């Protein structure tokens, strides 16, 4: 990650861009598994396997609260979503497929955000 991403504090303008990125992910057709925390009814052992769960609604709350100080922190939460999914689910599962599509889309959007800063 470049120096700007690591430590240039997020400005209010940056935050408007982060909101747009997040909304783009939330609107993507393959984002359904990631919109809200994993339901333990859908995976009873999930919270014993995944020590730091993450989901787009938690990220939204954090964005609205101005939790993130640096772009790296936002990227780290987003990456947790995908890493948790690839670790918990087998590589042939629809969940894993959704993570590979959505992460690629996130990278496209993130590059656009970084260029716009
Ligand atoms: N939303 C939803 C529904 C069912 C399941 C998940 C999520 N899981 C996931 O790992 C998805 C988030 C990547 C756990 C296994 C089954
Ligand atoms: Cl939608």
UniProtKB/Swiss-Prot annotation:
Ubiquitously expressed, with highest levels in testis. Present in kidney, liver and brain. In the brain, highest levels are found in motor cortex (at protein level). It is found in: Cytoplasm; Nucleus. Phosphorylation enhances DNA-binding. Residues 9-113 form the Bromo domain. It comes from the Eukaryota. It is linked to Neurodevelopmental disorder with dysmorphic facies and distal limb anomalies: An autosomal dominant neurodevelopmental disorder characterized by variable degrees of developmental delay, intellectual disability, speech delay, postnatal microcephaly, dysmorphic features, and mild abnormalities of the hands and feet. Regulatory subunit of the ATP-dependent NURF-1 and NURF-5 ISWI chromatin remodeling complexes, which form ordered nucleosome arrays on chromatin and facilitate access to DNA during DNA-templated processes such as DNA replication, transcription, and repair. The NURF-1 ISWI chromatin remodeling complex has a lower ATP hydrolysis rate than the NURF-5 ISWI chromatin remodeling complex. Within the NURF-1 ISWI chromatin-remodeling complex, binds to the promoters of En1 and En2 to positively regulate their expression and promote brain development. The second PHD-type zinc finger mediates binding to histone H3K4Me3. Belongs to the PBTF family. Interacts with MAZ. Interacts with KEAP1. Component of the NURF-1 ISWI chromatin remodeling complex (also called the nucleosome-remodeling factor (NURF) complex) at least composed of SMARCA1 (isoform 2), BPTF, RBBP4 and RBBP7. Within the complex interacts with isoform 2 of SMARCA1. Component of the BPFT-SMARCA1 complex at least composed of SMARCA1 (isoform 1), BPFT, RBBP4 and RBBP7; the complex is catalytically inactive and does not remodel chromatin. Within the complex interacts with isoform 1 of SMARCA1. This is Nucleosome-remodeling factor subunit BPTF. It comes from Homo sapiens (Human). The lineage of its organism: Eukaryota, Metazoa, Chordata, Craniata, Vertebrata. The gene is BPTF.
């Amino acid at each position: 990650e470049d120096a700007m991403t690591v430590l240039t504090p997020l400005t209010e303008k940056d935050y408007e861009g982060l909101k747009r990125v997040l909304r783009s992910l939330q609107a993507h057709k393959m984002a359904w598994p990631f919109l809200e925390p994993v339901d333990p009814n859908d995976a009873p052992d999930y919270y014993g396997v995944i020590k730091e769960p993450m989901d787009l609604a938690t990220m939204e709350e954090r964005v609205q609260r101005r939790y993130y100080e640096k772009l790296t922190e936002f990227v780290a939460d987003m990456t947790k979503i995908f890493d948790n999914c690839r670790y918990y689910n087998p590589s042939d599962s629809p969940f894993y497929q959704c993570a590979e599509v959505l992460e690629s889309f996130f990278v496209q959007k993130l590059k656009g955000f970084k260029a716009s800063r």
